Amino acid sequence: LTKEGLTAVIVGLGWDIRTTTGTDFDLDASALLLNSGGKVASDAHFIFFNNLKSPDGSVEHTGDNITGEGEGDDEQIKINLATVPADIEKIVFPVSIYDAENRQQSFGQVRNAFIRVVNQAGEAEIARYDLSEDASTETAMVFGELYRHGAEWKFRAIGQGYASGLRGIAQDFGVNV
Ligand SMILES: [Ca+2]
Ligand SMILES: [Ca+2]
């Protein structure tokens, strides 16, 4: 009498604190909630360090970690798919290094950098990306997206790099930034 949908998910980003002297590694997890035209539903549907919750309340970022201090996921974005508004069709997950050009930083310099998505109904890992190893030369990437498939939600890994940083990503998806 049990049937069948992803309903609550957590995206987790972690990395290790820089051991050499120099500016810290400040990685950032973001989310963009898109409409059926692939555009952010409003500028406040870009969830990041300066906007930690969606207006609808379905997507919340737990807070900005600017060094990597702490084990496991250093930043998390919690998504309650049940309460995502109907107008939202996809939620895309960028990962970036803050101020990477000025700091001359890339994922390959950072130790044990990973991003993952966990199905909270049972803590099963859905997908992981090894940023240190597989996005070595990158400073910003789209990890993946949750998307509607009929009445349910699925995840799709994307793994696409962007040379123009988090701002460039935000621009492509129609954020006024
Ligand atoms: Ca951060
Ligand atoms: Ca850490």
CATH number (domain holding residue 82): 2.60.60.30
Q: How many residues does the chain have?
A: 177
Domain count, the chain: 1
Q: How far is the CA of 78 from the centre of ligand 2 (A)?
A: 18
Q: What is the resolution of this structure in A?
A: 1.8
Is residue 172 a known part of a binding site? no
Q: What was the elucidation method?
A: X-ray
Whether 131 maps to a domain, the answer reads yes
Is residue 65 a known part of a binding site? yes
Amino acid at 128: R
Three-class secondary structure of residue 94 per DSSP: strand
What is the C-alpha separation between 127 and 138, in angstroms, rounded?
19
Please give the residue range of the domain that contains residue 15: 5-172
What is the C-alpha separation between 155 and 92, in angstroms, rounded?
10
Residue 124: count of CB within 10 angstroms of its CB: 8
Whether 154 maps to a domain, the answer reads yes
What is the C-alpha separation between 77 and 16, in angstroms, rounded?
19
Whether 9 maps to a domain, the answer reads yes
| Residues sharing a CB contact under 8 Å with residue 60, sequence separation 6 or more, in sequence order | 47, 52, 53, 54, 77, 78
Smallest-distance ligand from the CA of 73? 2
Whether 33 maps to a domain, the answer reads yes
Smallest-distance ligand from the CA of 27? 1
Whether 177 maps to a domain, the answer reads no
